[PDB]
Design a protein around this ligand. Structure first.
Ligand SMILES: CCc1c(C#N)c(SCc2ccc(N(C)S(C)(=O)=O)cc2)nc(N(C)CCNC)c1C#N
Ligand SMILES: [Zn+2]
Ligand SMILES: [Zn+2]
Length: 842
DNA sequence: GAGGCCGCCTGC
DNA sequence: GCAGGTGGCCTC
């Protein structure tokens, strides 16, 4: 035979007889030993597990419990992983003892007590270095969220110790945390049992608390007539508008007609369970009775009621609704305004999910004020901000209250000056970050300006966005591009992390950072952090979901030192167009998401172009007055926030690029209706403001793809159309109102949708760029009504900069500073997650 | 400096 | 095939 128990049994739990030791052919096995197990096809490598229990089964025979390790190559790291590094996972199962192939040694590599001083790995060590030739683990891994975290520290029961499986225990904790449950009973009525409290997903709900509910959870009293359908596309003069046919897509870039409704908000009146005919309550079916809260836009006053109202302003209602407890999307605080000790602004700024109501809403009296008697300091982290720009990321972190950016590195001098203007106590370095790091590593204390260099222990948080020029393609690395990456600013920034070993680390970038070079930039970044011993994760965030009227996805890498909690990604605050909120990432055929659970709705309504800039005075093309009058108070909640509490007599930087006479005429001929762009231009001559003329565009070749006009005219302008001929200059066709190059190459660029495009008041900005040009890719830069490009101030508003935030240089310098920044509201959301970790640190 | 001009690749 | 991701040359 081969397998024989060592000793007598220790417990007989039914059909199972547990043992403490077993003997397989020439080895002995005890609880706690590590083993390998062959897979079902010997092509796949060995599985590795820890033995947590051993028992004879009355029917199936000799058994053990395997708590599997995860091979590094099976994580997001893939083949960048240390070949002998394993990761802890909550994966386990009962297994026949006959599946064991060998006993294996696995070492736990704990970070030293002096970990923060052990940095100084060279880039080759960070990128490609491995540990000393044995199986080891340092970190636990979440396979769905791609999170590397310090190993959990669960403790066993006096009855668990002999068979304890930490994976089993943690999975039981998760299941119990996720199943909805009642806790305390309140009163026993004839048909149902009332409760004072319930819990769901770790959140405690009591009678009186506010709940978030899906928009589908209940309707309002409103009996309305159905609105009209989409704008009936009436025919147009195709000779006057030869490019209008290119708008057959019916889809409007930057439009909010597809954004979901925000949550329903209710106050728990009743938590109850149906009582069986037999007396006992059915506690698998928990129901909630709420009073409905009206948002302004839910009243007979439609959407326009939202224009001026506070974003968290509600009205009490006495309409009631019964929903399932499992429908609750979260807890929120809804409290009567004129009974809180603080003021409403301090309240709204002091915590998440805070709403207030001053009046009530009688629906079909359509009136206000209905029955009210029912309604009853850590120190900041010293922060180094690399590639800081003018300071949007540092500004959002400061607003979150977690950071003092004491050092910034910004190579472009106008942005460095702007950072200095907003951060007088900061030390701003303009030289190359490699130079600075090499100086520090050589033992220097000051740079060539006499500025004091940060040293180990000074830097507690490190953040930045490193440029990726040279390796921003999607195709795989070769030797040349990989050398560029090894000597890149990304790797320099990682070397900063390795040297200074801050408590928290943030790398922000364009969304496609997660896909560059077949995701190898991302995988190697994570590999470096793991090699340093950091907890770390990655994800994609949409800036609009955190309160700007702009679509701007960013890739985010977060890391936290051993001893810290690894931050979560922030839950979306505002609803936003779903097409702009694709946050998942596929790496090596594995789809990763973040912890974000608000996927289809959120607490606050979407922020619009109207919210963003309806208060700014009209200005002209080329507006250059640096200091003007606002001409009135803020109108929207967003404007109130960005203008701030203190009266501001002067509006700064509401200045616009001075476009040419031809470009100005084009802009003057873009209609104001939503979705308008160059394809709506007329094919006319126009006398320009400099006496010159704008010529009619007329065709030169037959586009077989697009065919001919409504009445025979060719829709082609170039020998290009032949698809096999070359460009002949005989149709260059300069100084045309309808630009020539857009029909020239439009068939391969989605009709150049959005160029010379107008913003719409109800919509959002396209990604705010460093130099707004109507004929650039992000060409939707025209004001909704004025015949001009958006101003520097309007771009700053689109990024969520306070109006008081100072910029520096000429108009193009200021546009670039604004367009390169992280939006402060996005940075603040991230920082508040970091603050949660600072407060939770054991 | 301001505008004209406009590739290659991915996900669906 | 549509929609989108990425700015960034040159030139006049
Ligand atoms: C649609 C407009 C456009 C655009 C646009 N938009 C771009 S962008 C190229 C790009 C990609 C990545 C990076 N990075 C370093 S990175 C870190 O990823 O930002 C920078 C530039 N190229 C275009 N070409 C003609 C290719 C380049 N000429 C040879 C065109 C065009 N027509
Ligand atoms: Zn288990
Ligand atoms: Zn051509």
């Amino acid at each position: 035979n081969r397998i024989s128990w060592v000793g007598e049994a220790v417990k007989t739990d039914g059909k199972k007889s547990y043992y403490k030791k077993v003997c397989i052919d020439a080895e002995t096995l005890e609880v706690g030993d590590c083993v390998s197990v062959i897979p079902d096809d010997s092509s796949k490598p060995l599985y590795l597990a820890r033995v947590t229990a051993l028992w004879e089964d009355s029917s199936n025979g000799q058994m053990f419990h395997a708590h599997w390790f995860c091979a590094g190559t099976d994580t997001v790291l893939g083949a960048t992983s240390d070949p002998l590094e394993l990761f802890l996972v909550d994966e386990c199962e009962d297994m026949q003892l006959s599946y064991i192939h060998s006993k294996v040694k696995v070492i736990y590599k704990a970070p030293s007590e002096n970990w923060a001083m052990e940095g100084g790995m060279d880039p080759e060590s960070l990128l490609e270095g491995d540990d000393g030739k044995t199986y080891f683990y340092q970190l636990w891994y979440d396979q769905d969220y791609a999170r590397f975290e310090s190993p959990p520290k669960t403790q066993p029961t006096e009855d668990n110790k002999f068979k304890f499986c930490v994976s089993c225990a943690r999975l039981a904790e998760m299941r119990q945390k996720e199943i909805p449950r009642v806790l305390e009973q309140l009163e026993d009525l004839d048909s149902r049992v009332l409760y004072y409290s319930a819990t769901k997903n770790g959140i405690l709900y009591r009678v009186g608390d506010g709940v978030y509910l899906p928009p589908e959870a209940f309707t309002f009293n409103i009996k309305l007539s159905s609105p009209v359908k989409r704008p009936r596309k009436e025919p147009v003069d195709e000779d006057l508008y030869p490019e209008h046919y290119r708008k057959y897509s019916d889809y409007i870039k930057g439009s909010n007609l597809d954004a979901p409704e925000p949550y329903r908000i209710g106050r728990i009146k009743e938590i109850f369970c149906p009582k069986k005919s037999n007396g006992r309550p059915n506690e698998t079916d928990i129901k909630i009775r709420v009073n409905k809260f009206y948002r302004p836009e839910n009243t007979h006053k439609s959407t326009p009621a939202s224009y001026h109202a506070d974003i968290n302003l509600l009205y009490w209602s006495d309409e009631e609704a019964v929903v399932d407890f499992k429908a609750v999307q979260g807890r929120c605080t809804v409290e009567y305004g004129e009974d809180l000790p603080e003021c409403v602004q301090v309240y709204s700024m002091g915590g998440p999910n805070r709403f207030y109501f001053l009046e009530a809403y009688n629906a079909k009296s359509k009136s206000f004020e209905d029955p009210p008697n029912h309604a009853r300091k850590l120190p900041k982290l010293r922060t180094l901000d690399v590639f800081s720009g003018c300071g949007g990321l540092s500004e959002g972190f400061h607003q979150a209250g977690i950071s003092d950016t004491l050092w910034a590195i910004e190579m472009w001098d106008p942005a460095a000056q702007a950072f200095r203007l907003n951060n007088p106590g900061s030390t701003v370095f303009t030289e190359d970050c490699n130079i600075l790091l090499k100086l520090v590593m050589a033992g220097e204390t000051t740079n060539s300006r006499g500025q004091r260099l940060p040293q180990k222990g000074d830097v507690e948080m490190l953040c930045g966005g490193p440029p990726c020029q040279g390796f921003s393609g999607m195709n795989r690395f070769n030797s040349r591009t990989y050398s560029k990456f090894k000597n890149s600013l990304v790797v320099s920034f990682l070397s900063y992390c390795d040297y200074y070993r801050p408590r928290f680390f943030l790398l922000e970038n364009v969304r496609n950072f997660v896909s560059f070079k077949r995701s190898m930039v991302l995988k190697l970044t994570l590999r470096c952090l793991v090699r340093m011993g950091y907890q770390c994760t990655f994800g994609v965030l949409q800036a609009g979901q955190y309160g700007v009227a702009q679509t701007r996805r960013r890739a985010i890498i977060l890391a936290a030192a051993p001893g810290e909690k690894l931050p979560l990604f922030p839950e979306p605050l505002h609803v936003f167009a779903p097409r702009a909120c694709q946050l998942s990432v596929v790496v090596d055929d594995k789809k990763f998401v973040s912890n974000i659970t608000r996927l289809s709705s959120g607490p606050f309504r979407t922020i619009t172009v109207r919210d963003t800039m309806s208060d700014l005075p009209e200005v002209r093309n080329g507006a250059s007055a640096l200091e003007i009058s606002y001409n009135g108070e803020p109108q929207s909640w967003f404007q109130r926030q960005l203008r701030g509490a203190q009266y501001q007599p002067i509006l700064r930087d509401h200045i616009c690029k001075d476009m040419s006479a031809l470009v100005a005429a084009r802009m003057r001929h873009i209609p104001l209706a939503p979705g308008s762009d160059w394809r709506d231009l007329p094919n006319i001559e126009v006398r320009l403001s400099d006496g010159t003329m704008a010529r009619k565009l007329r065709y030169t070749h037959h586009d077989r793809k697009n065919g001919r006009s409504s009445s025979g005219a060719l829709r082609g302008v170039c020998s290009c159309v032949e698809a096999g001929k070359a460009c002949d200059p005989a149709a260059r066709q300069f100084n045309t109102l309808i630009p020539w190059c857009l029909p020239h190459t439009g068939n391969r660029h989605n009709h150049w949708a959005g160029l010379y495009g107008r913003l719409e008041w109800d919509g959002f900005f396209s990604t705010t760029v460093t130099n707004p040009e109507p004929m650039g890719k992000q060409g939707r830069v025209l004001h909704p009504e004025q015949h001009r490009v958006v101003s520097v101030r309007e771009c700053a508003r689109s990024q969520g900069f306070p109006d008081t935030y100072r910029l520096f240089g000429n108009i193009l310098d200021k546009h670039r500073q604004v367009g390169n920044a992280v939006p402060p509201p996005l940075a603040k959301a991230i920082g508040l997650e970091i603050k949660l970790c600072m407060l939770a640190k054991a």
